[PDB]
């Protein structure tokens, strides 16, 4: 009526457990080899005698007269890096200045080009991720920039995280303090005329916390031109003003120590040519600015909760509309689950008291190369850093229909959103508990 | 129809609870003794009269006319060390230099050999675990190295955690800062010509966060030869260059205070003979380098979520294909569960501001013995340390079939992946609640 028979052993009734597990010493040796914990074979047999493979011949038979089903809970555990190549978090296109030249007697010829910089897999934490990006902009300048004109003064594109506009005085037209108040509010990207960044093929966008208000329109390009209204205002010549006590004030600090120009639009304007995203969003025209088509969001280092799909092709019936095949990247799905990664949050009031000390701690100002320029400076570390953290996930799918004849060797397969094994799985295993559902 | 009888007590119906518990004062005295919380006996009787053992005679009878089953939830609690012998996290083979000699008139005879260093069980935290490893490399040099030639200058194998390549200038061919930027990115292992490490029999690999892209091929050996492309570049002679203001620059600092050689390949090259894994992974040939067969992963101190299997040989029916036996290491399994250990993550911006202070805090530079050599230095402590932490696990297995005659003494057994009691269990106990499933 509801048996469960196996080769030659006492028949069992009503229910039991078949175990899908990678570890088994025997099968690892033989079976999987060129496989990994995301696409492997395993014997469900569990009987000490019998050579695996020869096991493959045997079968667990759930009484034929009834349609069976089984509860499938699984234990999935990864250890995927915040920033890696497979997830698309190690690359990102941006347009920078390539050459600054003296041409055809009087012309200033500026040549800009798009280029894709890559990051060294792993390096978690958001802030640091920013830094690694800024550094990659530089590392490039080091291989092309300088040796083709282009000064530091005109480095296009830099990810910062502050509100260049806190000091700002509605009359002066300047950041009175003479310094862009060094506190971190949200990541944003700053651009110089003519350049900009593109994330079309990268989840890092999600790390900065900047998304399109219309996601499905593939094409994340944020040009200098887009950051309308909201160019970082200029600094008051704190020195002049004070010593001068008319009043100098109108004097908007044009350079800095080591004399770098703050590219001011004209000898008059209080504004600089440096455009900030964060500004355009909440300080620019809400109806036509950038706030119109992009959204200011919480960072999230994981870069985006993605899901993984399970499949047990040789043991569960194929769900409603999937068709059975043998193409690993199209197997039927039997369970979906978010990919095991969380955002742990910490507190480091030590940030920026630490950037200050961190710089001495790290024997180099590698990230802060321009410790004077109020722009190109090293963005403030925000209190509350986030870090992707891997965690085992004791998930639980529902009862799923089973085949009344379970093969000795079952194939287990965890796929990702785009349907492809996921290299970062360290442990995957599931427990199935069959039971009756109705009869034929 | 569905009774539940016991010796001479009123019959009970429909369900109840039998308790599997180690603590009981009586049985501990008699029964278990030479056993432990992972393989013990216990009386299910729970009746104050009756000498245990004499209890063993009695039996709980679930009505014969029906096939019963019972819900089995358990409470498991361990306290296993991050690094211990049983889990294979206290040893690890590496190949180091044994002797440096002056031979047969003009020959420089270098003799290398493999050797297995061990760690002192317990010592959690990842960073510190690294240190303990580096220290073991040293401790060995202290017993063989020096007293056979081999200088410190040529110590093969050292686990570090930084990106020897941040300063790097695409033209100079040197790390301009004159210092390998002291910030921690990911663990990696550095090697000198001729040596290397092997983890074939160790989970520490998983601690460093370096795995094979093809796990089942038993054999984790990472030779110097493998770390192709990606030898730690050399340092700019910061002193020369500056004082000299042609420009010295090409000058790649050959030694350091206390004069140790940075083994530069030749009087010309800007590269040193020191090869870094982390470099090869993201800075070397992606198609043939190491990134081809190894994967950069998140650390994880636990060294690898492993599972444990339960078994109640004398109380549950043997699941589908297991056969009943009396060999403790083959009992049938009735429930699987991950071994109770998590990765708690913390923030210590105090790292490297602390290594700096930690060294004065610890009255010795035991781990930093070579505070000058930019390589052999003490790796930076990474912000965000991880620590294996034991936690009670209130798990829940499903309803499992029961025998209609439950013995007075049941045997409980928690096994591990390889099937062997697990010494680190402090508390294990379960509650079973039988109930009808169908009739005969």
């Amino acid at each position: 009526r509801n048996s469960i028979r196996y080769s030659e052993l006492a028949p069992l009734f009503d229910t039991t457990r078949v175990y899908l597990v990678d570890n088994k010493s025997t099968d690892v040796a033989s079976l999987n080899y060129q496989n990994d914990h995301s696409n492997f074979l395993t014997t469900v047999i569990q009987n000490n005698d019998y050579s695996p493979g020869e096991a493959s011949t045997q079968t667990i038979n759930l009484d034929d007269r009834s349609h069976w089903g089984g509860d499938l809970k699984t234990i999935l555990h990864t250890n995927m890096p915040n920033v890696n190549e497979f997830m698309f978090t190690n690359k990102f296109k941006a347009r920078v200045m390539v050459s600054r030249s003296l041409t055809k007697d009087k012309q200033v010829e500026l040549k800009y080009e798009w280029v894709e910089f890559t990051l060294p897999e792993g390096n978690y934490s958001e802030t640091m991720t920013i830094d690694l990006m800024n550094n990659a902009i530089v590392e490039h300048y080091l291989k092309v920039g300088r040796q083709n004109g282009v000064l530091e003064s005109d480095i296009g594109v830099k990810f910062d995280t502050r509100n260049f506009r806190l000091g700002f005085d509605p009359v002066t037209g300047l950041v009175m303090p003479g310094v862009y108040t060094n506190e971190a509010f949200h990541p944003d990207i700053i651009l110089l005329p003519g350049c900009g960044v593109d994330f079309t093929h990268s989840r890092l966008s999600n790390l900065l916390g900047i998304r399109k208000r219309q996601p499905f329109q593939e094409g994340f390009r944020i040009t200098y031109d887009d950051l309308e209204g909201g160019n970082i205002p200029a600094l008051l010549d704190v020195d002049a003003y004070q010593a001068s006590l008319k009043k100098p004030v109108i004097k908007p600090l044009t350079e800095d120590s080591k004399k770098r120009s703050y590219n001011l639009i004209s000898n008059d304007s209080t504004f600089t040519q440096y455009r900030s995203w964060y500004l355009a969003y909440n300080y620019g025209d809400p109806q036509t600015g950038i706030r119109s088509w992009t959204l200011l969001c919480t960072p999230d280092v994981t870069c985006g909760s993605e899901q993984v799909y399970w499949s047990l092709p040789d043991m569960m019936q194929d769900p409603v509309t999937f068709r059975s095949t043998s193409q690993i990247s199209n197997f039927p799905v039997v369970g979906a689950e978010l990919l095991p990664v969380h955002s742990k949050s910490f507190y480091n009031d030590q940030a920026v008291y630490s950037q200050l000390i961190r710089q001495f701690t790290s024997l180099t100002h590698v990230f802060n190369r321009f410790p004077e320029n109020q722009i190109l400076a090293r963005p403030p570390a925000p209190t509350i850093t986030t870090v992707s953290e891997n965690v085992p996930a004791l998930t639980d799918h529902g009862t799923l229909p089973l085949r009344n004849s379970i093969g000795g060797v079952q194939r287990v397969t965890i796929t990702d959103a785009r349907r492809r094994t996921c290299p970062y799985v360290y442990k995957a295993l599931g427990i199935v508990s069959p039971r009756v559902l109705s009869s034929r | 129809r569905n009774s539940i009888r016991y010796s001479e007590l009123a019959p009970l119906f429909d369900t109840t609870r039998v308790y599997l518990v180690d603590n009981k004062s009586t049985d501990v005295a008699s029964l278990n003794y030479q056993n432990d919380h992972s393989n013990f006996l216990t009386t299910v009787i729970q009746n104050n009269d009756y000498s245990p053992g004499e209890a063993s005679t009695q039996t709980i009878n679930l009505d014969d006319r029906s096939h019963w089953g019972g819900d089995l939830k358990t409470i498991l609690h361990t306290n296993m060390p991050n690094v211990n012998e049983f889990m294979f996290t206290n040893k690890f083979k590496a190949r180091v230099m044994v002797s440096r000699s002056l031979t047969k008139d003009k020959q420089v005879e270098l003799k290398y050999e493999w050797v297995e260093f061990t760690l002192p069980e317990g010592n959690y935290s990842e960073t510190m675990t690294i240190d303990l490893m580096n220290n073991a490399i040293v401790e060995h040099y202290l017993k063989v190295g020096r007293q056979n030639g081999v200088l410190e200058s040529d110590i093969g194998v050292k686990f570090d955690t930084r990106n020897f390549r941040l300063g790097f200038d695409p033209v100079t061919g040197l790390v301009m800062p004159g210092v390998y930027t002291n910030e921690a990115f990911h663990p990696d292992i550095i090697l000198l010509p001729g040596c290397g490490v092997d983890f074939t029999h160790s989970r520490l690999s998983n601690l460093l966060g370096i795995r094979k892209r093809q796990p089942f091929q038993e054999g984790f050996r990472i030779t110097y030869d493998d770390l192709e492309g990606g030898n730690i570049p050399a340092l700019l002679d910061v002193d020369a260059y500056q004082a000299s203001l042609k420009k010295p620059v090409i000058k790649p600092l050959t030694e350091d205070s206390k004069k140790r050689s940075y083994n530069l390949i030749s009087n010309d090259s800007t590269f040193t003979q020191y090869r870094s894994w982390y470099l090869a992974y993201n800075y070397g040939d992606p198609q043939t380098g190491i990134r081809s067969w190894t994967l950069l992963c998140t650390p994880d101190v636990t060294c690898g979520s492993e599972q444990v299997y339960w078994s109640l040989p004398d109380m549950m029916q043997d699941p589908v294909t297991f056969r009943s036996t009396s060999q403790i290491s083959n009992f049938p399994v009735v429930g699987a569960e991950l071994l109770p250990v998590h990765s708690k993550s913390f923030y210590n911006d105090q790292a490297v501001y602390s290594q700096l202070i930690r060294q004065f805090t610890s009255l010795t530079h035991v781990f930093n013995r070579f505070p000058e050599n930019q390589i052999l230095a003490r790796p930076p402590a990474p912000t965000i340390t991880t620590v294996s932490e034991n936690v009670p696990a209130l798990t829940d297995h499903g309803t499992l079939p029961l025998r209609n005659s439950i013995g007075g003494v049941q045997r409980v057994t928690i096994t591990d992946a390889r099937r062997r009691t697990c010494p680190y269990v402090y508390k294990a106990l379960g509650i079973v609640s039988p109930r009808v499933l169908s009739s005969r």
């Binding site: 300048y141 300088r146 530091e152 410790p371 | 200038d169 301009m176 800062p177 700019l236 260059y241």
Partner: peptide
């Protein structure tokens, strides 16, 4: 005429 792009002073 070579920019090391690094503030050696401080």
């Amino acid at each position: 005429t070579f920019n090391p792009v690094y503030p050696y002073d401080t």
